[PDB]
Design a protein around this nucleic acid. Structure first.
Ligand SMILES: [K+]
Ligand SMILES: [K+]
Ligand SMILES: [K+]
Ligand SMILES: [K+]
Ligand SMILES: [K+]
Ligand SMILES: [K+]
Ligand SMILES: [K+]
Ligand SMILES: [K+]
Ligand SMILES: [K+]
Ligand SMILES: [Mg+2]
Ligand SMILES: [Mg+2]
Ligand SMILES: [Mg+2]
Ligand SMILES: [Mg+2]
Ligand SMILES: [Mg+2]
Ligand SMILES: [Mg+2]
Ligand SMILES: [Mg+2]
Ligand SMILES: [Mg+2]
Ligand SMILES: [Mg+2]
Ligand SMILES: [Mg+2]
Ligand SMILES: [Mg+2]
Ligand SMILES: [Mg+2]
Ligand SMILES: [Mg+2]
Ligand SMILES: [Mg+2]
Ligand SMILES: [Mg+2]
Ligand SMILES: [Mg+2]
Ligand SMILES: [Mg+2]
Ligand SMILES: [Mg+2]
Ligand SMILES: [Zn+2]
Lengths: 115, 183, 177, 60, 84, 59
RNA sequence: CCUCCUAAAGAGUAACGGAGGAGCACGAAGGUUGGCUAAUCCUGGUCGGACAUCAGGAGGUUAGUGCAAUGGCAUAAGCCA
RNA sequence: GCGGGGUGGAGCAGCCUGGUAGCUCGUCGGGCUCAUAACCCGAAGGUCGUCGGUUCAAAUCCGGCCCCCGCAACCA
RNA sequence: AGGGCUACACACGUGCUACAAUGGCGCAUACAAAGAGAAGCGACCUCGCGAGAGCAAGCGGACCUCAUAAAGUGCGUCGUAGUCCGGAUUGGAGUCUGCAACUCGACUCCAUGAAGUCGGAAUCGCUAGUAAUCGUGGAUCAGAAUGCCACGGUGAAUACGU
């Protein structure tokens, strides 16, 4: 139930429950379950403690949760401190990957700010 | 005064000739230091001429003050109001180009289009001096968009520039100037 | 009393050696541990205060005292004498048992725990820290959590300075960063 | 301690994944199973560039 | 990005300038228009004036800039906000 | 004095103009100085310096 | 009607003199027994911020008194049971 | 001397009885229209004249100061 | 040569993708038309999770290649959740074209996981193989379509009447 410092859902299938970890998607969830030798359709509640321990051991091989968050923060901070074009885009909160700003860009710019 | 002007112009002419000769000598002798010195002298002389030209451009009393620009539509009607809006945009763009700061004190927009009138404050160095010569009526000729037939129509708009003069300091009456009678 | 015996048998000796104390009575002691929940959002619903008090009672094994406003404050819309918090004071056996629980179970369960700050000493040797989610205590059942509660934990110590306080806490392998 | 007002407080066994078992008094009746403890947590255990990457990825 | 099999790209004139600057130990900024050139480790500590379109912005190369194009440190568009 | 200024102002109407902007012929001419240009778009966008400097130089 | 000054170190003392309050409240806010001590600031602390609750320190009544002002109040007259 | 007032851009409420700013027009955005008005659908805008006090807390209670109103200003 | 045409408080038009269960996902398995190809289409085989890479047939084509159509059908799962809906955004690692992917290409992998739960006033298209929905091709083109041009699959409702 408690993996990588967080609680995973108990009533879901194992793959969906493992996706709740920050840094684990469907592909990594399948990889973890395959390396732990557990069927994906088995609910988390229907697992012995040793199986959960094996799941924790398998998850330990990936950079997840706070480690991943601080890695991402370090990368973004490095860009912003370098002051490259991507860093400036991150500073000003505009799309970083060359998307149009004349219209759209609402995900980066937040809700519309009337003049 | 005549000596200031005449000596300034004679020193300008003589210093230009001297700078030309020194530049010829520097370019011939490939002296980088003399070249840089001549460049500095030319820059100083250019600044001197620019300053004199500035005084000549703005001899007027209030040329250094900030100014107010009033734009009023005229004979064209709706076309005139659209033309007045165009003039307002033009003058705002020119002020931005010159670095002056503009604000809209007052404005009356035409119902169909454009503006009936607008009062704009322009603040900057010699703003009134730079803008005073734009006072007058501006005539516009084009195919009026407010004419179903698209006829070629003439429209008139007026720009008036006046300096911002500080309000007079009101002064209380000197008692020696008054005679008081009781009866 | 495992940690109390560990104190009396190892921490006293280590601190005496480190600080060259003449008398054992000069060795710092862990006087008390105070857990406090500021439940200032209970003015709208006193029942939230009751649930927070239940959480604190479960965490500490002790019925909490309800603390009310010392004086009326308009900024937070509180009148004098209005119940806006709860607290527990742990001394002796209960204090040591809670200290062991906190060190060995609760602190490891802190989400993304990177180490407690060693600058959180009050200038006299007492150490205050904050807990953001009571779920770090296994007594709190995850399935029965109504609201994300937090608290603050103050270890009041007879130490005369921050150096002595941090030495005493480190002697218990307190996870300073 | 006043009678009848405090939560029931009796000893239980907390067993962790790393084999650490500690018997401690607590309010919760059932014995505890821990995914992590102070004997195995990465921070407690202590187990918790551009030029290099360039020269590695562009080995000439 | 460019394929790893092709290796990093750098203009030949800029590469020669960087090599000459490193060998000679000169401290004059290297003026260049090659915004598309990759920053190489041997450039670290050099000042390179990269053309932004109308002027050469000085860039003091540090180890964190290695692997990026020189144009990433010379913004080409001027923007200070609307309604200013 | 303000009324004197207001009465001195020229009519915004036919026959009075310091400058003519004819877009069909794509010409702009200042009546006072005679300066004429063909870049009506630039002048409308704010290239008034030619006219202003000509007026100041004329004095 | 109450408090201070005028009022001249007992009382008292005027002016359309200088400043403020009252026309109630409380079955506890009264009696007794037992206990306790403030304002304010600083430091540390989840949300929590200038200001809530917690811990320590400095300070020593600069608080408090149901309501004006004066005189009192630590043996407290202040706070709790 | 005695009374009133001063609050989104304008005109009025909210004060009395402290906690909480409203109405009508106006402004702005989108509609309708060939276009404008009208009309329809949405928004925004006042920390309450100015200081001070009182209060846990003031548009509100108190006191100055400023402006505006009324009255009163007599026998003499 | 470098930069811009790709800016970005904002307003509008044309689209695409959704807001789920008449669906999402996984496995398996049916049925098209039309068209393009020589500095081209490129099979096969091998390597790579993948985009792709290496080697290398055939075809100026009813012959070879692009190139398994998808919706559908069968089984299983999800069980009404901002979800196993949505896939924007962003971090890292790559591929290909191209002298050269920073400004400013496409695509892949891992992570990420926004608004959105059917949209005010108002407004649009369509009368039958039509609307709706599902795939496929082409030109332009080194590379770069949610646009356009074209092709098939499934396949309605309603028209009292002026
Ligand atoms: K862009
Ligand atoms: K007296
Ligand atoms: K009592
Ligand atoms: K589109
Ligand atoms: K649309
Ligand atoms: K989701
Ligand atoms: K590009
Ligand atoms: K819609
Ligand atoms: K193409
Ligand atoms: Mg693009
Ligand atoms: Mg006396
Ligand atoms: Mg006396
Ligand atoms: Mg007497
Ligand atoms: Mg008398
Ligand atoms: Mg009393
Ligand atoms: Mg007593
Ligand atoms: Mg008493
Ligand atoms: Mg208020
Ligand atoms: Mg060019
Ligand atoms: Mg364009
Ligand atoms: Mg999905
Ligand atoms: Mg993904
Ligand atoms: Mg939402
Ligand atoms: Mg839903
Ligand atoms: Mg028809
Ligand atoms: Mg289609
Ligand atoms: Mg094609
Ligand atoms: Zn353990």
């Amino acid at each position: 139930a408690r993996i990588a410092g967080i609680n995973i859902p108990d009533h879901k299938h194992a793959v969906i429950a493992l996706t709740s970890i920050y840094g684990v998607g469907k592909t990594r969830s399948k990889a973890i379950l395959a390396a732990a030798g557990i069927a994906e359709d088995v609910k988390i509640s229907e697992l012995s403690e040793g199986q959960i321990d094996t799941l924790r051991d398998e998850v330990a091989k990936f950079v997840v949760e706070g480690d991943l968050r601080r890695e991402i923060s370090m990368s973004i901070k490095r860009l912003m401190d370098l002051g490259c074009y991507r860093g400036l885009r991150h500073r000003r909160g505009l799309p970083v990957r060359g998307q149009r700003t004349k219209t759209n860009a609402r995900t980066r710019k937040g809700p519309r700010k009337p003049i | 005064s005549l000596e200031a002007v005449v000596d300034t112009l004679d020193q300008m002419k003589q210093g230009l000739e001297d700078v030309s000769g020194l530049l010829e000598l520097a370019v011939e002798a490939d002296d980088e230091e003399t070249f840089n010195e001549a460049v500095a002298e030319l820059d100083a002389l250019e600044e001197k001429l620019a300053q004199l030209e500035f005084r000549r451009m703005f001899s007027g009393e209030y040329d250094s003050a900030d100014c107010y620009l009033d734009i009023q539509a005229g004979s064209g009607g709706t076309e005139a109001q659209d033309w007045a809006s165009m003039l307002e945009r033009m003058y705002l763009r020119w002020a931005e180009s010159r670095g002056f700061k503009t604000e809209i004190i007052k404005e009356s927009e035409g119902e169909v289009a454009g503006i009936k009138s607008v009062t704009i404050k322009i603040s900057g160095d010699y703003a009134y001096g730079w803008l005073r010569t734009e006072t007058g009526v501006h005539r516009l000729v084009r195919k009026s968009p407010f004419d179903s037939g698209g006829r070629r129509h003439t429209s008139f708009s007026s720009a008036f520039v006046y300096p911002e003069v500080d309000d007079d300091i009101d002064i209380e009456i000197n008692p020696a100037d008054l005679r008081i009678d009781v009866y | 009393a495992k940690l109390h015996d560990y104190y009396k048998d190892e921490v006293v000796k280590k601190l005496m050696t480190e600080f060259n104390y003449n008398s054992v009575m000069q060795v710092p002691r862990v006087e008390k541990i105070t857990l406090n929940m500021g439940v200032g959002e209970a003015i709208a619903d006193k029942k939230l205060l009751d649930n927070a008090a239940a959480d604190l009672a479960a965490i500490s094994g002790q019925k909490p005292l309800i603390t009310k406003a010392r004086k009326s404050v308009a900024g937070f819309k509180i009148r004098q004498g209005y119940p806006i918090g709860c607290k527990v004071t742990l001394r002796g056996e209960r204090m040591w048992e809670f200290f062991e629980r906190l060190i060995t179970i609760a602190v490891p369960r802190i989400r993304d725990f990177r180490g407690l700050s060693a600058k959180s000493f009050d200038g006299r040797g007492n150490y205050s820290m904050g807990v953001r989610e009571q779920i770090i205590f296994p007594e709190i059942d995850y399935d029965k959590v109504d609201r994300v509660r937090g608290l603050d934990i103050t270890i009041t110590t007879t130490a005369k300075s921050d150096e002595e306080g941090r030495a005493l806490l480190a002697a218990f392998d307190f996870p300073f960063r | 301690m006043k009678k009848d007002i405090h939560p029931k407080y009796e000893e239980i066994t907390a067993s962790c994944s790393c084999g650490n078992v500690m018997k401690i008094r607590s309010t919760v009746g059932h014995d505890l199973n821990l995914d992590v403890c102070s004997k195995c947590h990465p921070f407690f255990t202590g187990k918790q560039g551009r030029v290099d990457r360039f020269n590695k990825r562009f080995n000439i | 990005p460019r394929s790893l099999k092709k290796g990093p790209f750098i203009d030949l004139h800029l590469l020669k300038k960087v090599e000459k600057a490193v060998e000679s130990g000169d401290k004059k900024p290297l003026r260049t228009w090659s915004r598309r050139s990759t920053i190489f480790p041997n450039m670290i500590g050099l000042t390179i004036a990269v053309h932004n379109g109308r002027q050469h912005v000085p860039v003091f190369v540090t180890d964190e800039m290695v692997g990026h194009k020189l144009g990433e440190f010379a913004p080409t568009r001027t923007y200070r906000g609307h309604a200013a | 004095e303000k009324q004197a200024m207001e009465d001195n102002k020229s009519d915004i109407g036919w026959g009075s103009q310091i400058r003519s902007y004819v877009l069909d012929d794509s010409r702009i001419k200042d009546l006072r100085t005679g300066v004429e240009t063909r870049n009506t778009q630039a002048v409308l966008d704010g290239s008034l310096d030619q006219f202003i400097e000509a007026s100041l130089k004329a004095g």
